């Protein structure tokens, strides 16, 4: 009455050579509690993923009808084996003889014409029915024997129906069911010659199996080994970046019929938006698209604190000092940039607009100024300059205006053409998220080891509400080890976030695979007091199903060795 390493199926149909692949979608953990019925007439249980197995000869249990609640409440798929005529109907309802009951609406007629132990594993994921077939000659009549029973798929008809039950068992028999539930875990399969498996290691049954799956080898030597214990209890995934808000004004930036000079660059503030970032990627005519702080692609994944826009016109190839560190005449007199800019820049040609064949003298730049400009500094002064005071009335001796106008014309070179540079200054200061990517969010699930994907904080853990010392203007928070400690929700209900996770990754001490079969654990940094409480309540990350505790000893750097006294 226990699944002794039963229910191993191929995760895909791609042929693989001799390697050690790690499977995640595989189900039916080894040594699981199977609800075998060794028999409103049937005993139809909930599906939740099942494992079909018939240990009776003469083909007693030959029909199973998947679907939903009976009595004509939802669509149900009929899989009946009658005289080698497998007709898969998915339209008959129930107000052997459960087919001709009602004929309201029928569609999708599928006809497939053509001791014993037949194993079947049924999977329903995103509306896809996966059916596998496996046979193994047995001789005992006590219970389910051991074995591997490599499964092979036979039918993969989705039907868009979430199966939840199974019925229509024959009569006039023994007659058993042997249906067992499955749990989502991780698996490590072996690929031998001729495309057969013949060996599988479920990384969820014992710490020794987890250690075997860690180093990716079917043999463990003596010593201490551990890799993050990240293949014990997986779960779903939560997301962020809630429903969209008013559109970002980034579109109206690249539409002004007129643009300022270099010394009088306008600073437009952008806040409380959800930037699409579609005008930056598409329309690939930006000849100087560069990013400095963030990656040029990872823009729809972050929530910037505050973004701006700096629009000015430069002359051709003179766009080489709008980068952090570059110096020159347009880097300390007209427009500056900090050493840590953390933003992108763009520049597109405007030869057919800001250029004439008779004089386009409308843009100027500052090239004579006392000292250098500070990061993000603007000066629109207009006065003759001399480093001795010297009000310098223009025509007196040698006074001239420290502003040289450009020479924009039509018949010129590439390096003398008006290039409008729009500088987007991104920020990640301590402030609520004012600009994010066009994504959707879901509900904040509590007390579940789901991976969290916040505005800019990713990872995994048990998201649980708590109480700490937070500030209204502060959105997220880090720990001493540069790890995300707490973060508020961008949508609403600003509360604390995931508490400290499991107390490190426990190591597995094994004195040798060929030596013995014992298993012992070694916790890196724990107190050896609340470990049993966290394990018995299924709240700890390395929580094995078949696991116990014999003795815990607490010393300086204890590392309670559970497994040997």
């Amino acid at each position: 009455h226990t699944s002794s390493m039963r229910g191993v199926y191929y995760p895909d149909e791609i042929f693989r050579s001799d390697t050690l692949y790690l499977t995640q979608d595989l189900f039916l953990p080894f040594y699981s509690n199977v609800t075998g019925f060794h028999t409103g007439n049937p005993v139809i249980p909930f599906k939740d993923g099942i494992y079909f197995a018939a240990t009776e000869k003469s083909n007693v249990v030959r029909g199973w009808v998947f679907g939903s609640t009976m009595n004509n409440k939802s669509q149900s798929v009929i899989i009946i084996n009658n005289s080698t005529n497998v007709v898969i109907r998915a339209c008959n309802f129930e107000l052997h003889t459960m087919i001709f009951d009602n004929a309201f609406n029928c569609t999708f007629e599928y006809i497939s014409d053509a001791k014993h132990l037949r194993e079947f594993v049924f999977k329903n994921k995103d509306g896809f029915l996966y059916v596998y077939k496996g046979y193994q000659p047995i001789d005992v009549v006590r219970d389910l024997p051991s074995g591997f029973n490599t499964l092979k798929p036979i039918f993969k008809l989705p039907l868009g129906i979430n199966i939840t039950n199974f019925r229509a068992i024959l009569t006039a028999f023994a007659a058993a069911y042997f249906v067992g539930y499955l749990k989502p875990t991780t698996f490590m399969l072996k690929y031998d010659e001729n495309g057969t498996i013949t060996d599988a290691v479920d990384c969820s049954q014992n710490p020794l199996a987890e250690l075997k799956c860690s180093v990716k080898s079917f043999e463990i030597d003596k010593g201490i080994y551990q890799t993050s214990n990240f293949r014990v209890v997986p779960s779903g995934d939560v997301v962020r970046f809630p429903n969209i808000t008013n559109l970002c004004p980034f579109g109206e930036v690249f539409n002004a019929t007129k643009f300022p000079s270099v010394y009088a660059w306008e600073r437009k503030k952008i806040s409380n938006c959800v930037a699409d970032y579609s005008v930056l990627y598409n329309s690939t005519f930006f000849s100087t698209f560069k990013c400095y702080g963030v990656s040029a692609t990872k823009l729809n994944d972050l929530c910037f604190s505050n973004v701006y826009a700096d629009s000015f016109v430069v002359k051709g190839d003179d766009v080489r000092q709008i980068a952090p560190g570059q110096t020159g005449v347009i880097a300390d007199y007209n427009y500056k940039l900090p050493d840590d800019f953390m933003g992108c820049v763009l520049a597109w040609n405007t030869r057919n607009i800001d250029a004439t064949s008779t004089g386009n003298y409308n843009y100027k730049y500052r090239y004579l100024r006392h000292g250098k400009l500070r990061p993000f500094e603007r000066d629109i002064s207009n006065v003759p300059f001399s480093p001795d005071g010297k009000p310098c009335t223009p025509p007196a001796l040698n006074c001239y205006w420290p502003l040289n106008d450009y020479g924009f014309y039509t018949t010129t070179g590439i390096g003398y053409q008006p290039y409008r540079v729009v500088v987007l200054s991104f920020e990640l200061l301590n402030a609520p998220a004012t600009v994010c990517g066009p994504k959707l969010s879901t509900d904040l699930i509590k007390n579940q080891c789901v991976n969290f994907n916040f505005n800019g904080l990713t990872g995994t853990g048990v998201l649980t509400p708590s109480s700490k010392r937070f500030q209204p203007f502060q959105q997220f928070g880090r720990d001493v080890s540069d790890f995300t400690d707490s973060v508020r929700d961008p949508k609403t209900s600003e509360i604390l976030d995931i508490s400290p996770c499991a107390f490190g990754g426990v190591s597995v001490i094994t004195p040798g695979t060929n030596a013995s079969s014992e298993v012992a654990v070694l916790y890196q940094d724990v107190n050896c007091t609340d470990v049993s409480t966290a394990i018995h309540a299924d709240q700890l990350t390395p929580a094995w199903r078949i696991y116990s505790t014999g003795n815990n000893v607490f010393q300086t750097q204890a590392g309670c060795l559970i497994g040997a006294e």
Partner: antibody
Amino acid sequence: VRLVESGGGLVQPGGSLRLSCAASGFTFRNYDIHWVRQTTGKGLEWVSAVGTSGDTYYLDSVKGRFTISREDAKKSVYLQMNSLRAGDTAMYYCVRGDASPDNIYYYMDVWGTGTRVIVSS
Amino acid sequence: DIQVTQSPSPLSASVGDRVTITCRASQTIGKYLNWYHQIPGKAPKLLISAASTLHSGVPSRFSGRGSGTDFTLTISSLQPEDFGTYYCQQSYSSPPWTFGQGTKVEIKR
């Protein structure tokens, strides 16, 4: 997580020759894919990359000549080389970019095996 | 651009494990720089992260430090299966993903 290359290179300078980069069981619908040019004794000079959106990046030198395209379901990325010159004979790789916290690094996570596109007689 | 210059001389690795792999650059960058490794014959691979996020695949013996503009690659006891050329790349200029030059590590006899 492994990428397998395909094809090679034999055409003369002045022709067209595309490449391909497959994928594996990893979720190849949100990560990035870039190219790498190793001339067997020179620098890894390639910056072209395509992201989740319609982002198409290229190099300043080879601009307007090469085009990039990717397919999510097919798990394949293509790179067509139009108007191929004689100074591109090298081994082309395929890399993937990813940032752990949000954006800081790319790490060039998983490489490939390589594809030699030589242009001579 | 962000001109990065590595060590211009290959470091012949003796029985010791004292390497001085430097990745100095023109401007200053906090952690926008990584380190790779390529055994001659195969494709390159990641060896050292941005000095504070070394993940699996590479043994924990390979350490890394860096701040400002002077980067140092501290490596623990060397192994014979960990030889080849180690490259470093800057992560500041996002479109121009320009790598370094290369530092070869050979055997001393």
